[PDB]
């Protein structure tokens, strides 16, 4: 059955402004689509076992990836900060199915995750609808 | 050596409606960003030698990828209409730097390319500004 993850982005700090610069979809479970409905990023997936990655960028150099997916019928999420120049969104998205620490993050099936970058800025994902096929999550930027 | 490719999408046939469902950026040349300015898709790249893939999807089931980038200081593009169910945009984008047939398609440095899918719908990419670091291309859907 189709899984959908609707993401709302909350920027709370005026000292920086992030905007999406990359939207990727993993190939498993017949892939999926990244779309927009009323300023909401909607990830529609063909089933459980795949994911999608949003990469954001602020004009001050700061950047992070926010990956949302469904592993064994349960939602998961992870945030990667301090990205290298050759660490684009498609690079990160694939790592959750090849790189050990990333695979463990997905297998944790978190309804919420929190991490900071080197500058101290906090990034959080919180699933407000954390069960079923219609998932909703807030992306909160500190 | 920063390159920018501005893409304008033209849909000419009311029997279908396509919309972007994936925007990827290849990791080479310090990667880059996919952005939006006045309904135009803007691919900014840190240098020559990388690319970005836009995957489009119609509600009838039709899909294709339009990849734009710079190879050897000249613009290039390619359209893939025979998307496998496990071939998302990030899959296609990487193949231009791993699969020989896609490598050759990139190294041809096309500023103009036309191709159809199995249903007979035509897809076209034309660079109206095919010179310099500020490149401009039309994506015309038949």
Residue numbers in the entry:
A (entry chain A), B (entry chain B): 0 to 141
What does the published report state?
Sclerotium rolfsii lectin (SRL) is a cell wall-associated developmental–stage specific lectin secreted from the soil–born pathogenic fungus. SRL displays a clear specificity for TF and its substituted glycan structures. In the current study we report two recombinant variants SSR1 and SSR2, generated by the deliberate changes of the amino acids incorporated at particular sites of SRL by the synthetic gene construct method based on the complete amino acid sequence of SRL. Interestingly, SSR1 and SSR2 the two different variants of SRL, differ in their glycan specificity.
In case of SSR2 amino acids at the 1st, 14th, 34th, 113th and 123rd were replaced with Val, Asp, Ser, Gln and Gln, respectively. The crystal structures of SSR1 and SSR2 lectins in their free form were determined at 1.7 Å and 1.6 Å resolution, respectively. Like SRL there are two protein molecules (named mol A and mol B) in the crystallographic asymmetric unit of both variants related by a non-crystallographic two-fold symmetry. The mutations of SSR1 (N14D, E113Q, E123Q) and SSR2 (T1V, N14D, T34S, E113Q, E123Q) were all identified and all atoms of the mutated residues were well defined within the electron density map. A bound MPD molecule was found in both variants at the same place like in SRL while in the SSR2 structure two additional molecules form the crystallization medium were found bound (MPD and a 2-amino-2-hydroxymethyl-propane-1,3 diol). In the structure of SSR2 the mutated residues Val1 and Ser34 are located in strands S1 and S2, respectively. In the SSR2 structure the T1V mutation leads to a shift of the residue by 0.6–1.0 Å (depending on the atoms) while the T34S mutation does not cause any conformational change on this residue. The adoption of this conformation of Asn81 in SSR1 is made possible by a shift of the entire loop encompassing residues 81–86 by 3.0 Å on average, from their positions in the SRL structure. This shift is less profound in the SSR2 structure (1.0 Å on average) and does not lead to a change in the conformation of the side chain of Asn81 which maintains a similar conformation to that of the SRL structure. The carbohydrate binding property of SSR2 remains unaltered compared to SRL.
